Design a protein around this ligand. Structure first.
Ligand code: ZN
Length: 207
């Protein structure tokens, strides 16, 4: 009835692939490192595949609906996600009723093609107050977690603005904020993402 976490072995292609996506999509942030910390590399502690029958059924069911509405293309992408909700997501799935980033009049679940972007939201908006233990947004000690996710984008609506909506526009299934400094991918239904890989990691302190 629950989630099985399967550990990948570091010598497997699949683990190496996930780390490669993670390490290589790091970019400099306009922050100067304030929200996510100062680093140019991660220390990857563990990578786990999340398996949950119920999460998978909801994802696959929505994926078929999107294909039908999108000339038989679900338009799936692998994308990164960071939020303080990681533990609830791997057990309960993504839930849009948490409007982590939007607000009390905002909506949408955010993903990034750049892992360093997702890492800014691991402790909250603007990096919250940092790690629970040390209250350090730039903690090199505490193990952080993020997700590398299957995301059903369907027909994406592209925008280039400091604006954001509370649903996808007519005909569409996701919203892309284009560079902004980096791209952001927004979906408005939780069943449009599956939390494939759970990455446990530290940011590294430069020498
Ligand atoms: Zn800490």
């Amino acid at each position: 009835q629950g989630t099985i976490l399967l550990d990948l072995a570091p010598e497997d292609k699949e683990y190496q692939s996930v780390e490669e996506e993670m390490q290589s999509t790091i970019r400099e942030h306009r922050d100067g490192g304030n929200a996510g910390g100062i680093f140019n590399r991660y220390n990857v502690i563990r990578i786990q595949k999340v398996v949950n029958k119920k999460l998978r059924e909801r994802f696959c069911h929505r994926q078929k609906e999107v294909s039908e509405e999108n000339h038989n293309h679900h338009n799936e992408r692998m994308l990164f996600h960071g939020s303080p909700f990681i533990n609830a997501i791997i057990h309960k799935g993504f839930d849009e009723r948490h409007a982590y980033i939007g607000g009390m009049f905002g909506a949408g679940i955010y993903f990034a093609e750049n892992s360093s972007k997702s890492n800014q939201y691991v402790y909250g908006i603007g990096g919250g107050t940092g790690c629970p233990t040390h209250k350090d947004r730039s903690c090199y000690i505490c193990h952080r977690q993020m997700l590398f996710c299957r995301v059903t984008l369907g027909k994406s609506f592209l925008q280039f603005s400091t604006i954001k909506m509370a649903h996808a526009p007519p005909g569409h299934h996701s919203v892309i904020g284009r560079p902004l400094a980096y791209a952001e991918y927004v979906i408005y239904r939780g069943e449009q993402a599956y939390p494939e890989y759970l990455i446990t990691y530290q940011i590294m302190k430069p020498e």
